[PDB]
Amino acid sequence: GPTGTGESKCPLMVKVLDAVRGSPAINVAVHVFRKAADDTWEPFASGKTSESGELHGLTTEEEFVEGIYKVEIDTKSYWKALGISPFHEHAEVVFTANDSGPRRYTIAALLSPYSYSTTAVVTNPKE
Amino acid sequence: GPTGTGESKCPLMVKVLDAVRGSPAINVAVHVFRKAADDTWEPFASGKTSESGELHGLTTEEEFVEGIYKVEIDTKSYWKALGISPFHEHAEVVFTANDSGPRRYTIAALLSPYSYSTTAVVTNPKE
Ligand SMILES: CC1=C(/C=C/C(C)=C/C=C\C(C)=C/C(=O)O)C(C)(C)CCC1
Ligand SMILES: CC1=C(/C=C/C(C)=C/C=C\C(C)=C/C(=O)O)C(C)(C)CCC1
């Protein structure tokens, strides 16, 4: 498993779906941050979802150390570009990772203009 | 039940449900904040949900002016009290409050240990 800003066995993956059109939510910007020593959020990784609504390759197993991470989904620009003025500014998922060892995390979000749902699927690696 | 920063017509209400037990999520801490010129968040109101899982009297119409607000729900303390290991650190809902539109805002949240869903009901009448 590789080291730095690429994809190991992809420890963090984000998947976003659209509940109004019944399709993946394409081109949604995603920003990830790690809480720093000094209690503030430092930028950790970023990207855009693909044609299938997924974003892989945000980090490696070597760079994804234990910590508190924040994944911010720009849902507002997403809906605005489809001409809807949605309710939320963005959708955020904050969680503690790899505190009992490394794990793979998939963060999924289902979006509607006035509602969002999020779920996480966590698997214990090995290959 | 409870309250916050003083009781009026109830321009903002929060309701929290438990998907694991099919009940209202009681005694959950809720904090609300208003975004400031310097872009940081300032405390605005807070409280704990009552027996029916609702939190009212957080603000009043004079004080609730346009801006961007953040509602933070301490979901982690809620699952720990139940003996469940939860995934999220808390649930946040960030939205812009506008005059133009409707006035009553109900933010509802349905919690599971690895997943949460949030919806907003914005009306002209009550609740
Ligand atoms: C049910 C559900 C969710 C998970 C969806 C997943 C895990 C979808 C995987 C593949 C799909 C839906 C088909 C596809 O890409 O073609 C999320 C967390 C969004 C929250 C709302 C309820
Ligand atoms: C969040 C949530 C849910 C609960 C909603 C509740 C308890 C709403 C109460 C009042 C509302 C939404 C405003 C209105 O008075 O019209 C259900 C179980 C549907 C599942 C999806 C997630």
Descriptors for this entry?
homodimer, 127 residues, mainly beta, Immunoglobulin-like, 4-stranded antiparallel sheet, 1 helix, binds (9cis)-retinoic acid, retinol-binding, retinol-binding protein
Describe it for me?
Chains A, B: Glycans are attached at residue 98. 2 copies of one chain form a homodimer. With 127 residues, chain A is mainly beta. Chain A has one helix at residues 75-80; strands at 12-18, 23-24, 29-35, 41-48, 54-55, 67-73, 88-97, 104-112, 115-123. Chain A has one domain (1-127): Sandwich (Immunoglobulin-like), CATH 2.60.40. In chain A, a hairpin with a 5-residue loop joins β3 and β4. Chains A and B meet through β7 and β9 of A and β7 and β9 of B. β7 (88-97) of chain A pairs antiparallel with β7 of chain B. One (9cis)-retinoic acid binds at residues 15, 17, 106, 108-110, 117, 119, 121, 127 of chain B.
Task: Please render the helix and strand layout as text.
2 copies of one chain form a homodimer.
Chain A: E1 12-18, E2 23-24, E3 29-35, E4 41-48, E5 54-55, E6 67-73, H1 75-80, E7 88-97, E8 104-112, E9 115-123
Parallel strand pairs in A: 1-8
Antiparallel strand pairs in A: 1-2, 1-5, 3-4, 3-6, 6-7, 8-9
One (9cis)-retinoic acid is lined by residues 15, 17, 106, 108-110, 117, 119, 121, 127 of chain B.
Give a short summary of the structure:
The structure is a homodimer of 127-residue chains. Chain A is mainly beta and 127 residues long.
CATH class of chain A: Mainly Beta
**Helix proportion of residues of chain A, in percent?**
under 10%
Task: Using the CA coordinates, give the radius of gyration of chain A.
Answer: 15 Å
The CATH architecture of chain A comes to Sandwich
Structural class designation of chain A = mainly beta
Q: What are the secondary-structure elements of chain A, in order, as H or E?
A: EEEEEEHEEE
Counting DSSP E segments of at least 2 residues, the number of strands of chain A comes to 9
Which term fits the overall shape of chain A?
Answer: globular
Small ligands present: (9cis)-retinoic acid
How many domains of chain A? The number is: 1
Q: Strand count, sense and closure of the main sheet of chain A? A: 5 strands, mixed
State the end-to-end distance of chain A. 11 Å
CATH superfamily of chain A: Transthyretin/hydroxyisourate hydrolase domain
Treating each run of at least 4 consecutive H or I residues as one helix, how many helices of chain A?
1
Strand content of chain A: over 45%
Keywords (chains A, B): Amyloid, Amyloidosis, Cytoplasm, Disease variant, Gamma-carboxyglutamic acid, Glycoprotein, Hormone, Neuropathy, Phosphoprotein, Secreted, Signal, Sulfation, Thyroid hormone, Transport
Organism (chains A, B): Homo sapiens (Human)
Pfam family, one (chains A, B): Transthyretin
Glycosylation sites (chains A, B): 98
